[PDB]
Design a protein around this ligand. Sequence first.
Ligand SMILES: [K+]
Ligand SMILES: [K+]
Ligand SMILES: [K+]
Ligand SMILES: [K+]
Ligand SMILES: [K+]
Lengths: 82, 82, 82, 82
Amino acid sequence: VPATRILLLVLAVIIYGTAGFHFIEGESWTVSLYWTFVTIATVGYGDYSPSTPLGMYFTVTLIVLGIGTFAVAVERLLEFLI
Amino acid sequence: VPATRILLLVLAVIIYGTAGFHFIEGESWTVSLYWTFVTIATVGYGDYSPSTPLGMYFTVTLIVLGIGTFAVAVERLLEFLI
Amino acid sequence: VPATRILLLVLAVIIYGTAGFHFIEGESWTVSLYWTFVTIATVGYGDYSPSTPLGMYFTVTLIVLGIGTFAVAVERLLEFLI
Amino acid sequence: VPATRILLLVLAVIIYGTAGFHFIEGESWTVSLYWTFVTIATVGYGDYSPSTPLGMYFTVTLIVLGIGTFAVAVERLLEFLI
Ligand SMILES: [K+]
Ligand SMILES: [K+]
Ligand SMILES: [K+]
Ligand SMILES: [K+]
Ligand SMILES: [K+]
């Protein structure tokens, strides 16, 4: 995949994760963006996590769609900076 | 490995993780499925974690069997969507 | 690397992590073995974590030596089971 | 990339992460170095995490710049020890 296409794909993931956590779990937009990165990078501090069943379902969907996408995006960013 | 075989393998992992956490640590089926994904993806929020020795042993077995399986499944899903 | 050599290397990592957490942070052998796997797999629940400076130093040493070793061992175990 | 260049790159990441967490979130230098490794290795215990908006932004920047760099450094260290 061209590197710019990978960029758009992870941006789409980040939008999905952020808006979903905001609306489902009710955290601010900023906290939700932070949580989305912490989740798809697999860091997982746990300072924020879903506490509702819908949130848990949604979080599984973000884990499945987002972790591989982020990993490829990181791998590509590595090339254009090193 | 054919992609559909990898799908079945991770589904088997998800069943093992979920039923085990449910019966050993006593959390609901839904929470247990959520915990299983959060564990084999290596996110690890810690909102749920085993608190019994059997649970800790079981969790090590899920980590060894499940993290590589999930990683391959993600890598394959990437191909059939990008 | 031959797969059996990788097995011995991760076992050595697991012994190092477990005895170190036990003696430095004072948790039981079982909890310490559990923490060692949760750490080198990068799950990181945080139900257990070092609270002393020596423990924090030691944990960095386990992260550097152990995460790559575990990742290779998982990758190999995948081959001999799939 | 030559292995010594990768070493310098991850050291630069570690300096960036440590000084940033120290000054933005106010934790000691030692705790901040520990947190930086726990973050870029994707362990993410959550015993320490940013609680300010600037800290959350900064942490996203460390996740994007640091996780791939650490992963390559681990992969290389593996070669020069096995
Ligand atoms: K983690
Ligand atoms: K974690
Ligand atoms: K990899
Ligand atoms: K992780
Ligand atoms: K955690």
